Amino acid sequence: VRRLLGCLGSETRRLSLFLVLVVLSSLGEMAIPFFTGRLTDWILQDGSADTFTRNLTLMSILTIASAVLEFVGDGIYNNTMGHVHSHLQGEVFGAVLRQETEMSRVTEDTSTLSDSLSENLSLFLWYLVRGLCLLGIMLWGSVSLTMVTLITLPLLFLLPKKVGKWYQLLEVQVRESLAKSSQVAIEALSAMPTVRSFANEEGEAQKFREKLQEIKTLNQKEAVAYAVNSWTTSISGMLLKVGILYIGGQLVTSGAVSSGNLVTFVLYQMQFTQAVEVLLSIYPRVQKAVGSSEKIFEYLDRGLLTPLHLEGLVQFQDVSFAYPNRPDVLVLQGLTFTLRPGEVTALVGPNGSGKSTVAALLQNLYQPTGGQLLLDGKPLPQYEHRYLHRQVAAVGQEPQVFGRSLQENIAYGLTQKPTMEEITAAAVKSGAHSFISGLPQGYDTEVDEAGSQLSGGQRQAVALARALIRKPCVLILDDATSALDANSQLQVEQLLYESPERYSRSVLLITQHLSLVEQADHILFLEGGAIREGGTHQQLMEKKGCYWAMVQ
Amino acid sequence: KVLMWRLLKLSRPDLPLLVAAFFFLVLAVLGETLIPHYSGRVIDILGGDFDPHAFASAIFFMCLFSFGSSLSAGCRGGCFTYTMSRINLRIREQLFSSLLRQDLGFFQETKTGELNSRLSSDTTLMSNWLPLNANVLLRSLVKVVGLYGFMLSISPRLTLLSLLHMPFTIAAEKVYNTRHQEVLREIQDAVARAGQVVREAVGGLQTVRSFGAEEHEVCRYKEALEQCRQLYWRRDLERALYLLVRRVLHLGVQMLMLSCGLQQMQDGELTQGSLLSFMIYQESVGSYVQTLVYIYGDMLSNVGAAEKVFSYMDRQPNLPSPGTLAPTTLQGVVKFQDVSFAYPNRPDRPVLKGLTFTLRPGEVTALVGPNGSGKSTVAALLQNLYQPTGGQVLLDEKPISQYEHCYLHSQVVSVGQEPVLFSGSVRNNIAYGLQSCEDDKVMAAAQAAHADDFIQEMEHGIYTDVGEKGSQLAAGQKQRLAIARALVRDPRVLILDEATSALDVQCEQALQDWNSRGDRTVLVIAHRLQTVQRAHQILVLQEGKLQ
Amino acid sequence: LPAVEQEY
C-alpha cells in the first residue's frame, strides 16, 4: 500500500543496529531519578553507611553509556540517512529528465520533504522508545500510580486537539484574508501611473482600510481563543501533577510504598509530560511529510549498431509528424524525403507546420507520428543511444552554449574531450574565436550559464563551432539564419559547402538563408503538412514554382 | 540602535493592553515560581508525621497558586497576541499610505515583487518585537532572578555550585549558536549551486537531448549533491557532539549536586522536602537561561528588518509642492516652451529636446512620428506626472504645478493604448476616481463611448464583475471601457493614445464630437495618416524634435 | 536526539 518505505531495502542492517543503540541509551537515562529515591531513603533510615558510593557509581556509569550510545546511535542514522538521501535525489532527477521535450519544482519538493521526514523520524524513534521504556521502569515502582497516569493521559491527548482545531481554523482564515488584503495593494501599485493619473491616491487608501477593518474584527476572536488554548494545556498539565501527589500521599501513608518511591514518580512523571508532548507535536509534521511525498512516487515509478559517423543514407515513407500536446495536433504527413552522403539541401515552410518535429524526428529524439523512416538503411532506434547521437548532430532552433569555457564547453557527451587549442581552432574555423578571443582568458575563459556570455551574434557561431567540433557525416539546422547577422551565417554556409565535407558528409538546413537557397543541391518544402515545394530558389523560380510566386 | 525607539513609540496607542498584560505577566511568574516550593513542603510534611491539618492546607495553597499562574498565563498570552494584531494592522495602513505619495520614477525602478515581500511578509516581523520578543526576554529574566532567590532561601551553600557551572553552558551555547549558523550557510551555498545545476538543465533541455548527454547532467548533480552530503554530515555530527558535552555536563552538576546535598542532609540545614524543591528548581533554570541568550538572536532579526520598512517610510518624494489654484472655469489652452525631459533612472538622454507648441480649445492636434514611441512622454508630461527638466508648461497661461492635484485631473484626462482596469464591477471602473457618480450619468457615458451596446449582455448590466487586471474582458471591450472612463469625467483637455488599435475612424469621431472634444482640446497620437482627415494641425516627432 | 520559544 504505502510506497514511502520502498527505499529502505538497501540498508536494513544499519537501522536495526540503530534501534538496539536507542533502547540501550533509553534504559541508561532512567537511572538518574531511580537512584535519587534510593539514596534519599538510605540516609533518612540509616547513617552514612558507605552504601551510597556503590549506588552513586552506577548512576554515573549508566547515564554515560546513554550519552555515548546515543551519539554512536544517531551518528550512524544521519550518516546512513544522507547516503540514501543522496541516491534518492539523483534518481528522482534521473527520472524527470527521461521525458519528452514538451519543471525544477519536482526536485524542489523532494529537496524539502526529505529533510523534513528524515529529521522528524529520528525524533519519533528516540522518544517513542524513551516513552515506552520510561513506562517500563515506572511500572516497576508502583502499579497504582501507573494506572492513574495512564487514565489521565488521553485527556492531554484529546482536549488540546479539540481546542487546537478551533485555533487552526481561525489562524488560517486570518492568514488567507491578510494575503487577499495585501494582494489588493499590489494591484494598485502595479498600475500606479493610472492611479496618479486619476487622482484616486486617497481612494485606494480608503479601499485598503475597508479590507483591513474586516480583519480587525476577526482578530478579536483570534485572541480570545488563545487563552483557552493556553488554559487547556496549562491546566491539564497541572491537574495531573496535583493528582499524582494526592493519590501518592494516601498510598504512601497506607504503608504500601516508601517516601522515596514517591520521589522517583515525581521526577518520572515530569519527564513523561515533555516526552508525550514532544512526540505528539511532531506527529502532524511527519504525517504531512509522508502524505505529500507520495506525489513524488508518480515520477519515480513513472541497438546493435555503434556508429562513430552516419553512413549518410536516409529515406522516408508516408511519415507524419505531430505536436506533443495532443494526437490531434498533427502538423505533417505523407513525408517521403530521402538523403544521401554529399547532399546539400535547404528547407522552408509555414511556421509550426511540422518543420521542427521533422528535425527532431531525424535526430530520433521523438518517434514519427505515422508512416516509416530509416537512416543508413536501418531504423533509427537500431543504434546505441550515445553512438547514434554521435552519428549525426544538428544546430538547435535557439543557439546557445553551456556555462563552460570555449576550450571545454563543446566536449559535452563526447567520450574523448578534444584539445583546448583544438577547441580554439574549431572556434576560428566557425568564426566564434573572433569574439571568443575577447574573453578574459580567451578560449579558457568560462562562458556565462545558459549562453549569457554573449548575444545572438556569437551564440549562432558558437552552435556551429559545437557542431564543427564533432564534424559529423550528417548535419542539420533549423531557423539558424535568424539568430545572428545574415552575411556571416551565409558565409558560414558557403564555407561548409566549400569544405571537403561536401563529399565526406551531408547537411540539410531548414532556414531561409540566401546562400543555402542558391547553393542547394536539392531541397524539399512543405505546405499545410504535406510536401508541396522543393529545389533551389533560382531553379524553382525558373520553373514557375512557389519561389516564382513569392516574387509578387 | 536608536531605531528601536521609533518602533517602541509606535505601540503607545495600545497602552490599555500592554499595561494590563504586563500586570498579568508578573502575576503569572510569581504564581509559577512558588509551586515547586510547596511541592517539597508537602513531601516534607508527609514524612515523620500524619497531620491532615498540615497536609490538606499545603495542597490547597499549592493548587491555588499554580491555578492562578495557569489562568494568568492564558490571559497574559491572550492580550499580547491581540496587541500583535493591532500593531500589524496599523503599520500596513501607514506603509501603504506612505508609498502612494512617492513619485512615478520610484516605481519604475522598484519591482512589485520586492514591495510585496516588504509589505505583506516583512511587516509581520515588525509586530513580533514588543508583543513576542520583549516578553520572552522579560518573562525569562524575571524568572531567573526570582528562582535564584528561592535557591538562596533553601541553602546558600548549595546554590554557589550552580553559579560556577552555569557560565560553562552559556559559553558552549554561544559557540554553538554561531558555529551551526556558519556551517548552515556553507550547506546553503552548496545547495544553491545544486539548484543552479537543475535550473540550467531545465531551461535548455533541447540542447541536452540532441545527444546522449544526460550522463553529464547527473554527474553535475551527483557531485554537487555529494558536497551537500559531506557538508550535511559535518553539521549534525557537531550537533550530536554538542549534545553529548551538554548532557555529560548535566552530570557535572547532579553528580556533584547530590554529593553536597546528601552530606548536608546528614549534617543538617536540609530535608528531603527541601531538597526536592531545589532538585526541580535546577533543571528549569538551565532551560530558561539558555532561552534568554537564544531570544537575543531574534531581537536583532526583527530590529534588522526595521531598516527595510522605515527606509520606504522616510523616503522623501521629489515631487513639487501640491498646487492650490482651482478656477471656476477653464478655457483649456495648453502652451509649451523649450520643454525637455529624461527619465531619472535613464538620465542624460533627453527624449524630448526643446519642444514648443500650443493647443486651443476649438481645434484638434495630432502627433505623428515614431521617435521610438517616445511621443508617449508628452502624454505623461501634460498630466503633471513627471516634471519638465528645462522650461515649463502653462495651462491657461499658468504653471501647471500651481493647480490643485485633485482638481487638475478632474479636467485633464488621458487614455493610453493599454486599457488598465481594476478588479470589481464595471460600474466601479467607469466612474473610477470620482467621489460619487449617478448611475444615470454612466449610462450616457457608456452609450457615448459605445460601450453600453455590449456590456448589457453581461449579468446585471453595469454591475457585472471584472476579473483582476481586466482578465475577464476582451481587449477590444477593454479599450471602450477606458474611453468611457475618460468621457464620464467631462474633461476639458483629452489625450488619446493610439486610438487606431481597435477604434475605427467613426468610433474615434464619436469621441471627437463629444462635449469634451466638440469645443475642447483633444490630443491624438498615432502612427498612421488616418488622423490627417480631421486634425486641425499636424506635428511630426523625429528624434525627439518637432519639425 | 532530544528536543532543542514560540510561547508569548
Side-chain angles (χ1 to χ4, degrees), chain A residues 6 8-9 12-99 103-303 307 312 322 324 327 334 341-342 346 349-350 352 354 359-360 368 370-371 377 379 381 393-394 396 399 403 411 413 418 425-427 431-432 438 440 442 450-451 456-457 461 463 465 467 472 480 483 486 500 520 528-530 534-535 545 549, chain B residues 1-263 265-273 275-497 499 502 510 518-519 521-526 533-547, chain C:
Chain A
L8 269 58
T12 59
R13 199 264 282 274
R14 314 296 281 278
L15 283 297
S16 300
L17 270 293
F18 173 53
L19 163 154
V20 173
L21 315 192
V22 171
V23 300
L24 192 34
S25 172
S26 176
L27 291 182
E29 174 76 330
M30 283 331 82
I32 274 280
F34 181 85
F35 292 128
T36 305
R38 205 172 192 173
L39 305 312
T40 45
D41 291 326
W42 258 93
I43 308 306
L44 53 78
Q45 80 179 15
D46 203 356
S48 196
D50 215 339
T51 58
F52 35 76
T53 63
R54 61 179 290 253
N55 280 269
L56 169 149
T57 300
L58 301 182
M59 191 255 267
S60 76
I61 306 307
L62 261 289
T63 189
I64 280 295
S66 183
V68 163
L69 257 283
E70 158 274 328
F71 179 89
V72 181
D74 46 347
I76 284 295
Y77 168 93
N78 38 7
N79 170 281
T80 54
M81 194 31 252
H83 286 73
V84 295
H85 162 79
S86 26
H87 187 279
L88 295 174
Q89 306 300 143
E91 183 71 11
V92 166
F93 206 39
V96 287
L97 295 174
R98 300 310 309 286
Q99 310 307 325
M103 199 302 278
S104 62
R105 62 190 72 157
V106 190
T107 76
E108 289 156 39
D109 55 307
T110 176
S111 305
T112 176
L113 284 164
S114 54
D115 50 47
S116 183
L117 167 64
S118 61
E119 161 268 349
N120 281 288
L121 184 144
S122 73
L123 270 292
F124 161 106
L125 267 283
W126 271 108
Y127 276 106
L128 178 136
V129 152
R130 177 175 285 109
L132 168 63
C133 283
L134 171 58
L135 194 63
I137 165 63
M138 162 166 258
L139 194 57
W140 195 242
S142 81
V143 303
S144 182
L145 307 180
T146 46
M147 179 169 156
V148 170
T149 302
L150 262 296
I151 279 287
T152 88
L153 152 62
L155 297 187
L156 173 34
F157 174 26
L158 178 71
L159 269 283
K161 192 182 68 174
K162 178 184 172 186
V163 175
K165 183 61 61 69
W166 181 26
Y167 228 76
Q168 289 182 10
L169 170 64
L170 262 67
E171 192 278 334
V172 166
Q173 284 191 226
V174 157
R175 177 158 37 80
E176 62 87 14
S177 185
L178 205 75
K180 173 40 64 179
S181 66
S182 61
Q183 178 176 33
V184 165
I186 300 306
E187 188 184 28
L189 297 185
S190 188
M192 171 85 188
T194 67
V195 177
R196 180 60 58 68
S197 175
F198 290 114
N200 204 52
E201 61 191 36
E202 290 192 328
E204 298 316 308
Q206 188 60 28
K207 193 193 294 159
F208 187 66
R209 295 174 199 117
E210 173 188 314
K211 201 163 302 317
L212 285 199
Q213 182 192 6
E214 291 192 317
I215 283 178
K216 178 277 196 186
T217 179
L218 188 55
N219 274 278
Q220 202 141 344
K221 297 304 188 177
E222 170 80 0
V224 172
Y226 189 73
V228 299
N229 199 56
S230 171
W231 157 99
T232 292
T233 51
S234 191
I235 286 287
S236 180
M238 156 164 211
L239 210 36
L240 182 48
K241 177 174 308 317
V242 180
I244 180 176
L245 198 70
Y246 190 104
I247 201 71
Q250 303 309 90
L251 168 46
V252 61
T253 46
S254 185
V257 304
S258 72
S259 178
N261 299 115
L262 175 56
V263 179
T264 87
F265 258 82
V266 170
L267 296 180
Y268 274 20
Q269 175 56 34
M270 183 176 282
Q271 279 194 356
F272 203 113
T273 49
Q274 68 177 117
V276 68
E277 167 275 335
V278 161
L279 193 144
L280 260 294
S281 178
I282 71 176
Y283 188 82
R285 282 184 285 281
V286 63
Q287 274 284 359
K288 146 204 51 60
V290 68
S292 182
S293 58
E294 191 265 1
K295 187 179 63 67
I296 310 162
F297 288 84
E298 171 51 39
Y299 297 94
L300 155 73
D301 300 331
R302 186 69 173 168
Chain B
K1 290 193 293 284
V2 181
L3 177 55
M4 77 165 212
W5 193 97
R6 176 159 54 253
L7 178 53
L8 180 65
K9 170 60 187 289
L10 190 46
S11 303
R12 287 203 160 232
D14 283 291
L15 283 170
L17 299 180
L18 287 183
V19 184
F22 265 49
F23 183 82
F24 279 101
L25 180 72
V26 171
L27 265 282
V29 167
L30 299 191
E32 187 305 339
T33 169
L34 259 72
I35 172 176
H37 176 64
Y38 286 172
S39 180
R41 186 59 63 182
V42 152
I43 212 153
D44 170 40
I45 286 294
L46 190 138
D49 199 1
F50 190 57
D51 183 10
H53 312 83
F55 181 89
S57 177
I59 285 290
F60 173 69
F61 281 103
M62 190 266 268
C63 188
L64 176 62
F65 272 169
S66 180
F67 158 81
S69 187
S70 54
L71 163 153
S72 190
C75 188
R76 178 252 297 156
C79 300
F80 280 116
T81 194
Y82 194 58
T83 309
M84 191 275 258
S85 163
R86 278 161 60 127
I87 292 304
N88 195 12
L89 268 293
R90 180 154 64 245
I91 270 178
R92 286 170 192 256
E93 175 141 339
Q94 288 186 20
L95 176 61
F96 179 77
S97 183
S98 180
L99 287 181
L100 290 190
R101 293 182 183 174
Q102 297 299 328
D103 62 90
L104 270 287
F106 168 83
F107 295 108
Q108 196 169 27
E109 155 273 330
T110 317
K111 312 309 296 180
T112 57
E114 169 57 34
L115 287 167
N116 183 48
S117 75
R118 195 71 59 102
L119 166 63
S120 190
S121 158
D122 164 48
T123 51
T124 67
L125 275 62
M126 294 300 293
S127 322
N128 286 128
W129 188 76
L130 194 34
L132 201 157
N133 275 183
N135 266 37
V136 164
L137 185 138
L138 187 62
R139 176 155 46 72
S140 302
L141 182 162
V142 81
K143 182 183 301 302
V144 172
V145 167
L147 261 50
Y148 278 179
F150 275 50
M151 288 251 177
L152 188 144
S153 81
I154 288 183
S155 43
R157 209 181 196 287
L158 173 96
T159 74
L160 300 181
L161 294 296
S162 190
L163 284 192
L164 262 62
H165 164 273
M166 171 265 257
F168 286 72
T169 62
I170 78 164
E173 288 284 319
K174 198 71 172 185
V175 167
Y176 181 77
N177 275 346
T178 67
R179 177 67 81 229
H180 92 291
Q181 286 188 346
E182 157 213 10
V183 186
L184 171 59
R185 279 308 313 207
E186 292 168 11
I187 280 72
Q188 179 57 224
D189 298 351
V191 170
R193 187 171 71 89
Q196 196 271 340
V197 166
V198 177
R199 177 43 49 188
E200 184 171 46
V202 300
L205 78 165
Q206 61 267 19
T207 68
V208 185
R209 48 100 159 183
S210 69
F211 202 87
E214 79 283 356
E215 174 175 30
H216 287 178
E217 298 313 300
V218 300
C219 290
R220 274 159 155 248
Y221 189 70
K222 83 190 186 185
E223 296 175 7
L225 173 61
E226 198 276 344
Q227 181 188 3
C228 302
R229 187 187 51 68
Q230 297 285 4
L231 294 174
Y232 261 78
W233 183 24
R234 172 164 151 256
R235 188 206 68 164
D236 289 345
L237 175 140
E238 281 201 349
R239 165 142 63 98
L241 178 171
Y242 179 72
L243 159 65
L244 186 140
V245 53
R246 156 167 36 74
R247 177 71 63 69
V248 60
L249 256 284
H250 194 186
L251 263 277
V253 181
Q254 193 186 126
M255 169 31 189
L256 171 153
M257 154 56 34
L258 284 173
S259 83
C260 328
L262 274 293
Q263 177 66 44
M265 171 96 88
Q266 175 57 221
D267 296 343
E269 279 71 57
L270 198 66
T271 59
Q272 179 190 228
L275 178 75
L276 185 56
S277 293
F278 197 99
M279 191 46 38
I280 65 187
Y281 271 161
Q282 266 279 74
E283 77 303 12
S284 78
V285 166
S287 176
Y288 287 107
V289 75
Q290 156 277 342
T291 299
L292 183 138
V293 86
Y294 160 81
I295 212 62
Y296 199 87
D298 291 358
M299 280 314 198
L300 264 290
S301 301
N302 288 308
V303 174
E307 287 205 286
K308 292 201 200 175
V309 163
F310 283 99
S311 58
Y312 297 157
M313 228 60 186
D314 303 341
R315 170 190 155 98
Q316 171 60 52
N318 54 358
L319 295 179
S321 57
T324 57
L325 180 59
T328 174
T329 192
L330 203 85
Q331 286 284 8
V333 173
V334 159
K335 309 204 288 182
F336 276 76
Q337 300 100 0
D338 54 283
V339 57
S340 58
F341 160 86
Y343 292 93
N345 76 329
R346 193 67 167 271
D348 307 349
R349 302 194 316 122
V351 189
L352 282 43
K353 282 172 272 277
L355 319 192
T356 288
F357 67 113
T358 282
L359 321 177
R360 300 306 303 283
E363 299 168 29
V364 176
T365 300
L367 257 287
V368 286
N371 205 43
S373 299
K375 55 201 167 191
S376 177
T377 317
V378 173
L381 266 167
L382 197 50
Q383 298 168 90
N384 197 44
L385 301 182
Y386 299 124
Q387 289 305 319
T389 63
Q392 75 297 317
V393 67
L394 302 182
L395 181 144
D396 270 13
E397 290 62 49
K398 314 295 179 286
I400 197 162
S401 62
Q402 301 182 358
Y403 291 110
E404 181 165 40
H405 165 47
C406 304
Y407 161 65
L408 169 62
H409 304 105
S410 198
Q411 302 282 24
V412 192
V413 311
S414 66
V415 177
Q417 192 179 39
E418 309 84 358
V420 188
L421 284 163
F422 302 119
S423 62
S425 66
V426 155
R427 91 118 286 104
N428 195 64
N429 272 261
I430 302 281
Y432 175 84
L434 282 183
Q435 48 88 19
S436 63
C437 175
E438 310 313 309
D439 288 14
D440 176 62
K441 191 56 154 65
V442 177
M443 301 315 78
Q447 185 271 346
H450 301 153
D452 186 57
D453 311 335
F454 75 87
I455 64 133
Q456 290 297 332
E457 303 186 349
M458 284 332 88
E459 61 206 66
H460 315 153
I462 70 186
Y463 287 96
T464 179
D465 74 321
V466 189
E468 79 297 341
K469 294 190 291 290
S471 67
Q472 189 264 2
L473 223 34
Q477 293 163 321
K478 289 178 66 175
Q479 294 284 1
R480 292 191 178 213
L481 285 191
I483 287 289
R485 187 166 60 202
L487 262 290
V488 77
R489 216 172 310 280
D490 201 33
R492 194 48 48 81
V493 175
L494 269 160
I495 293 185
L496 304 175
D497 190 0
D519 56 343
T521 300
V522 54
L523 274 164
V524 55
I525 313 187
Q533 75 190 262
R534 74 182 209 270
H536 190 288
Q537 74 186 359
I538 302 302
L539 300 175
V540 53
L541 183 40
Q542 305 291 351
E543 192 30 60
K545 177 56 181 179
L546 299 321
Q547 200 71 28
Chain C
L1 259 183
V4 70
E5 190 74 3
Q6 54 302 349
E7 335 188 30
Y8 285 79

